């Protein structure tokens, strides 16, 4: 009957484009009917077809993005669109390892004289 998203994800890339082409052509006819005094029932189909086009485009874009992220997986430099967004300030932060770097004497102090667990007898 209507478009089911989980069924779209099982289609191939060519099929999605073919279905997208058909949906746009169908929507064009409905637009003509809207200006030629089309029946009220046919005018309600515009909303349904608009939803279908968006769903097909969403599936196509999601598959395309997913494949691209796999191609650049384990690469040093990624396209800016695929890099994490987060916030500007968070991206400029020192990494976790860098923030914890210390001089050799500071390292030795931690090993030689760390805080000890102790208690006072009552």
Partner RNA sequence: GCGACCCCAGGUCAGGCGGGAUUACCCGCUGAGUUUAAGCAUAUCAAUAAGCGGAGGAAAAGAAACUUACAAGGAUUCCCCUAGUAACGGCGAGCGAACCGGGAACAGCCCAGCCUUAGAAUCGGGCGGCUCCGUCGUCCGAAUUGUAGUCUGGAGAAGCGU
Partner RNA sequence: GUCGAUCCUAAGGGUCGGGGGAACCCCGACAGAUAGCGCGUCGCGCGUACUCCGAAAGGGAAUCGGGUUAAAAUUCCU
Partner RNA sequence: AAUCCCGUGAACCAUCGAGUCUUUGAACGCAAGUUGCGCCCGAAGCCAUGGCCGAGGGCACGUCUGCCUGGGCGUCACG
Catalog residues that contact RNA under the rule CB under 7 A. 1-2, 4-6, 41, 44, 48, 58, 61-62, 65-66, 69, 74, 76-77, 89, 91-92, 95-98, 103-106, 108-109
Asked if 105 is part of the footprint of other proteins (rule: CB under 8 A), the reply reads: no
Neighbours of 59 (CB within 10 A): 20
**Which among 9-17, 34-42, 43-51, 114-122 is the span making contact with other proteins, rule CB under 8 A?**
34-42
Contact 2, 48 (CB under 8 A): yes
Question: Token match 């923030």: residue?
Answer: 99
86 Rama class: left (phi>0) / alpha (psi -120 to 50) / beta = left
Region from 8-16, 42-50, 94-102, 109-117 binding other proteins, contact rule CB under 8 A:
94-102
CB of 122 to RNA, least distance (A): 22
| Cβ at position 34, least distance to RNA in Å | 15
Smallest gap, in angstroms, from Cβ of residue 69 to other proteins?
A: 8
| Cα angle: 68, vertex 69, 71; to 5 degrees | 65
CA 16 to chain centre: 19
Q: What residues contact residue 63 under an 8 Å CB cut-off, 6+ apart?
A: 9, 13
In the complex, which residues of this chain contact other proteins (CB under 8 A)?
24-25, 27-29, 31-36, 57, 64-65, 68, 72, 75, 77-82, 89, 92, 94-95, 98, 101-103, 106
């Amino acid at each position: 009957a209507r478009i089911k998203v989980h069924e779209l994800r099982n289609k191939s890339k060519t099929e999605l484009l073919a279905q997208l082409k058909d949906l746009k052509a169908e929507l064009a006819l409905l637009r003509v009917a809207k200006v030629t005094g089309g029946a009220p029932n046919k005018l309600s189909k515009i909303k349904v077809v608009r939803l279908s086009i968006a769903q097909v485009l969403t599936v196509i874009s999601q598959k395309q993005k997913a494949a691209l992220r796999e191609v650049y997986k384990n690469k040093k430099y990624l396209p800016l669109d695929l890099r994490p967004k987060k916030t500007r300030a968070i991206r400029k932060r020192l990494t976790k390892h860098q923030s914890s770097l210390k001089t050799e004497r500071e390292k030795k102090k931690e090993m030689y004289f760390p805080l000890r667990k102790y208690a006072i007898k009552v």
